Amino acid sequence: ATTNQLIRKGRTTLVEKSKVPALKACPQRRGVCTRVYTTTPKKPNSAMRKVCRVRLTSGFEVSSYIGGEGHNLQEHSVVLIRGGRVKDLPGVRYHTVRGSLDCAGVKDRNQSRSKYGAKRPK
Amino acid sequence: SMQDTVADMLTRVRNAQMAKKQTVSMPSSKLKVAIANVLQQEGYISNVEVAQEETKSTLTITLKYFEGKPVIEMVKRVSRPGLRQYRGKDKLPSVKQGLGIAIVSTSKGIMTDRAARAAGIGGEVIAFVS
RNA sequence: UAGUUGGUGGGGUAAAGGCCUACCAAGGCGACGAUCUGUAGCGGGUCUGAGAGGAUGAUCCGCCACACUGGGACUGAGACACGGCCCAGACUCCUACGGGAGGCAGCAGUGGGGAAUAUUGGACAAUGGGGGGAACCCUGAUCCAGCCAUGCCGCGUGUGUGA
RNA sequence: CAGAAUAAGCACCGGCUAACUCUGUGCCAGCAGCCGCGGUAAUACAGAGGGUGCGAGCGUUAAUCGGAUUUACUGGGCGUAAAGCGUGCGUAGGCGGCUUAUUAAGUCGGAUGUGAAAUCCCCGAGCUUAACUUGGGAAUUGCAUUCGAUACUGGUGAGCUAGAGUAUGGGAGAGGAUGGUAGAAUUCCAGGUGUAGCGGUGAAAUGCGUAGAGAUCUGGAGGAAUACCGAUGGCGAAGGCAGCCAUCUGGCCUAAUACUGACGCUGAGGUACGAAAGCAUGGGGAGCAAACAGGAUUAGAUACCCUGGUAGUCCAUGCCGUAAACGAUGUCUACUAGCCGUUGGGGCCUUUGAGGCUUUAGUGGCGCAGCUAACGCGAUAAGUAGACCGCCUGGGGAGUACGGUC
RNA sequence: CACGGUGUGGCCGAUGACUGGGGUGAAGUCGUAACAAGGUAGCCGUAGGGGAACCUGCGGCUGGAUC
């Protein structure tokens, strides 16, 4: 570009879209579990992974992964969700916080307890 | 069309040095002669001559080669008609940490950036030579 | 764009001025973005970056604007006035049904919303502010205290020996 | 004063990245920032031991800048990776040849005023240290006024001819528009000679023919296109332009004087032209041939092959505005080894007529330097520089939807 | 003159029976269009036709092999 072209029309900056639109620039969001179910991974992965469709206070309905082994969730549960992708699951962009509102911490876990929300053993 | 005769002169000198010519010739002007005199004083070129046929005037420059390489290794036009560059006395550019020269047109005539700083004046930065 | 742009006579203001008015003229703005439209309090500053730049405008200081929503004026040196008045609107409260009352975006606090942010505390002793000749009175400004690992900085949870 | 008495957790150990083994499970349960782990010996899942990093904290999520030269002013690109508008003309604008006088707007220098305090930085001071508080500086890169300088840019006056243009002689060309005309060939019609085939394919068949084909000879009708010359030739802004002749008409090349005296380059908007197909009205229609019909082939044929055949291809008057509209390379200017072809001109030399040297404007093949990721480009640059414009910012969604113009 | 009312016309948002294309996932059905001369060279513009990749006509390009 020439100097005159730059003066007539400057440079253009393209805005970056957020990868967590449903949070709406908040660290976490509260939602009501609409449907808890299991899904299969995209190739080359095979499993039965636990996910829940949740309606958020932001007015959006999304899908959130349930981490750890063993969960007590069901329909009409109230959960807290944070950001975070699951990679091999198409369209799962959020995670459910363990042990926050109605979700419970994982059982018989003694390492990385702050994640999955397990208290200290006696 | 030709709209920068100073850039034309610098390009002629650059191409002559790259082709290993002994002399280079161009149509002459007072600004070009002033720049060539500064080059000769700083030692990048050997001799400057002006000849006159009638109304026409021709400028001839004798080039210097030391060892195998040409003496003028880099010559860059800085100010151009599309973008003029003016600097104050405190922001005169230095070429190669003072090992080269910046040709500056000031109100006291054309000089190097070193002479301009010594005189405490600024002006238009014409070219970098190293 | 038609009080629109300029002029004259008059009015009006603390004061210049289409600020208003009656006539006269056809002007005034716009690709250097007028008009319309979306968003937004502005600055000193703050974060990042080698720099140039980019993002931001809590806490401190200056300016502006607002006070349930709109339209007004009074008193006064000063207001078109958060805890003043008049009018219109929505809402809320008391009632013996005759008649009345109100505006926490002041401090504390309640409900609600939210991932999330505190006590319905003490004193005018200090610095200021109002009144008074003074004595002195008032001051949720302020100075302090309470709660929270929210941040920064500091300290401890012991030291030596012991194969 | 009493007595160790009251006071350690969190994340991680496949690579990026400091820290490794054993059990349990077997593409399950699960992990995951990216690349990826798990399908019987998992240092990557869960537990344990050990270790590493931090420590009243440790991790996760969210957000800003950076790394990102990934909007490139500093500081990027457009032959093939994304990217030169299909091509011209031209408005606003940007930029602009040489000499001289003057001005002082840009530009540079000095002085003065201002740039609140706090904040940032420096030297100190007080907090048991530190955070923190605080004295004084430095800084606030800016703005305004005034006084100076005149090299460059701008303004004004004067002058010049190397850019640009004008008149006069000569030259080449499928440049454009209109109207005539010539020869070859295909088809059809008529007639003579003549008699069983012709045509078509890999092979066949559909088809034509004993109311006489095909073949051969004579005459006539009509439409479309111009063999040989013909060429890496020519002309045109591009799209494009071929028989011959006349009329009207554009540009280019070439020589020498003469003339004007910067009158120039580029160009957002705008406007003109713009292959083929297609559209509208009216003509024309030989050959060819989308659609369509039939015959073959094939597992199927919807196609390739064969026999037919309508739009269209042609003309007049308009529209449409798109192509791998390509050199996938915007226009203009200057400069930078050489060698060999070719087209249109100028000059010189032989010495008789045909050759040999140069120079200019086009058109080609190699190739030094230089450039490029490489391929390659290389005086017809993709090299060295300048002026202006257009365009690009991962792949799809998508040159799509909506709105608007035509 | 604020608030209000009437008529008509703009712009924005939400919602709507039904309807059209797009992406992703999994490879189930019919074919084999492209990549070699991909077995009819490919592609571009345009027009017509077809269950579908696609086929055919006209013009263009080499980013086409063998000669």
Ligand SMILES: NCCC[C@H](N)CC(=O)NCCC[C@H](N)CC(=O)NCCC[C@H](N)CC(=O)N[C@@H]1[C@H](O)[C@@H](OC(N)=O)[C@@H](CO)O[C@H]1NC1=N[C@@H]2C(=O)NC[C@@H](O)[C@H]2N1
């Ligand atoms: N002011 C300046 C004025 C400029 C003037 N107006 C025009 C001008 O000067 N332009 C500069 C030259 C650029 C040139 N166009 C680019 C080029 O040449 N190839 C493009 C790059 C492709 C690739 N990288 C090389 C390649 O594949 N090569 C082949 C190859 O050698 C050979 O083929 C085979 N299979 O072996 C040959 C014979 O078929 O063909 C060549 N291919 C071609 N030869 C043709 C040709 O030259 N042109 C037209 C077109 O057809 C060209 N393709």
